[model samples]
Target: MGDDDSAVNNNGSSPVNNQGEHIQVKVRSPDGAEVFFKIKRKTKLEKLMEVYCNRLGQSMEAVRFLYDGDRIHGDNTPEQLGIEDGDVIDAMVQQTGG
Candidate 1:
């Protein structure tokens, strides 16, 4: 077997090793607070909120996590959207309708 065969992750969505490295991201909120996170490339906007909600004692289903281009729901995965370095995720109120 070769090194290439040993490194294949068939079931994993984690970033390809040479594609980009996993990193500890420093995300800055609008209020000037810094949030440190460890994530791989292509992490979805929704997954990020799940972590924050777990930390803040909020409901993951009830929070809005906004990215640079759009407001994302919890179902969207960051990796699927190609999120990369220096991306900002903003927290906002849940979208409710009558």
Candidate 2:
């Protein structure tokens, strides 16, 4: 076993930091509400809501995620959600046309 062997065994998925295996995103709601969550690198917005929404006492359906001031795709899909380290993620209520 060598460098290549270790890499192959890990599947190239290395831990991001000592804090946890992945990154802890900064989820902020409107009015400047914020929280930290340790999640996988590619964790979807819907999954993230589990922690964020729970704290706010709201269901996943009532919340929406915005990254860098831009809304994610498909109206609500994790695969379409990708946030970076230090990036700002806002969790807000969904609004519809009246």
Q: In terms of TM-score, which candidate is strongest?
A: 2
Residue lDDT tens for model 1, 8-97 = 667567755663366444434436686876667556555577778787787545555666656766466555567655666766555451
Ten-residue stretch with the least lDDT total in model 1:
19-28
lDDT of 2 by residue, 28-86 (tens): 86776677665566655556666766878985556666666776642354334454555
TM-score of each: 0.54, 0.56
Model 1 per-residue lDDT at 61? 54
Model 1 alpha-carbon miss at residue 53, Å:
0.4
For all candidates in order, the CA lDDT equals: 0.60, 0.61
Q: In model 1, what is the error at residue 67, expressed in angstroms?
A: 0.6
Superpose all Cα atoms of candidate 1 onto the true structure and report the RMSD in Å to 1 decimal.
7.5
Q: Give the clash count for model 2.
A: 0
In candidate 2, which residue ranges exceed 4 Å CA deviation?
1-17, 73-83
